[PDB]
């Protein structure tokens, strides 16, 4: 019985067939990843351990993340068949849906009240 990955349940690393077939080209890439991580670690630790520092060690990665998650969207937005259809589907559609739900409910209720078939015997708070 093979593992079937899903969006919310990743494939275990020990069952990943690419985990074992490791080439010299793949070891070279892993070494370069550890060099970037080590270079950033050193840059951080030099400020983190500095006895004269008091404040926040600004992290450009955090600044880039908060900037991307807001200000950078509209400049890189293109009106096309995808964003327009998603823009319409989840922008106007719910308002029209709820309009008909509530409008239909209220027309039915108002027609019964006028005909005197809605029980409002003790309804004096509104």
């Amino acid at each position: 019985p093979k593992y079937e990955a899903s969006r919310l349940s990743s494939l275990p690393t020990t069952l990943d067939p690419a985990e074992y077939d490791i080439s010299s080209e793949t070891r070279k890439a892993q070494a370069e990843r550890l060099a970037i991580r080590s270079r950033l670690k050193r840059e951080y630790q030099l400020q983190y351990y500095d006895p004269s520092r008091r404040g926040v060690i600004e992290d450009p990665a955090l600044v880039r993340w908060t900037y991307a998650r807001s200000a950078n969207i509209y400049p890189n937005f293109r009106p096309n068949t995808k964003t327009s259809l998603l823009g319409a589907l989840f922008g106007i559609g719910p308002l029209v849906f709820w309009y008909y739900v509530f409008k239909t409910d209220r027309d039915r209720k108002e027609k019964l009240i006028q005909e005197g078939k809605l029980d409002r015997t003790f309804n004096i708070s509104y």
Partner: protein
């Protein structure tokens, strides 16, 4: 980043801990622990590394099928019932710098000794930076490892936040 040997030894430790979770009773666990150790021993001297990798891959598939869905976890290990329990009590040492003078006055001996550590940190820092400069290749460090102090009177570079970290049971 894990060698073949490291992968095998990690599976052995992991498989035994899930076996212990199934067996529960010590005499029963001892019996099946020896049977499992025998299975690793039969292929101990495999030389054809292609076969060794296939044995490791098949073993991992076997572990996944037979793992305990609720294995035992040491209380303070990640996922344990006491993991991170005392983090709320861990306060960094720099917080003592903001104590009111009357608060510091209650521990005259502690804060006198604290000033000695701060003096030691201050006088050691420039040499720590220099040692890292002269020992680091041009393109920056390639690993996270740090060196010892080389001369006498020197301290290992970047020692403060390791030496002065909060106690595991700080209150």
């Amino acid at each position: 980043y894990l060698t073949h040997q490291q992968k095998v030894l990690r599976l052995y430790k992991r498989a035994l801990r899930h076996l212990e979770s199934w067996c529960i009773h010590r005499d029963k666990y001892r019996y099946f622990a020896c049977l499992l150790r025998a299975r690793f021993d039969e292929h101990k001297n495999e030389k054809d590394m292609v076969k060794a990798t296939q044995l490791l891959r098949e073993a991992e598939e076997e572990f996944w099928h037979g793992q305990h869905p609720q294995p035992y976890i040491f209380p303070e290990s990640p996922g344990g019932t006491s993991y991170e329990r005392y983090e709320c009590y861990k306060v960094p040492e720099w917080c003592l710098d903001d104590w009111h003078p009357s608060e510091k006055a209650m521990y005259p001996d502690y804060f006198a000794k604290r000033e000695q550590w701060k003096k030691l940190r201050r006088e050691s820092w420039e040499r720590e930076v220099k040692q890292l400069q002269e020992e680091t290749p041009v393109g920056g460090p390639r690993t996270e490892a740090l060196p010892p102090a080389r001369k006498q009177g020197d301290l290992p570079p970047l020692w403060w936040h390791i030496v002065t970290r909060p106690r595991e049971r700080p209150m």
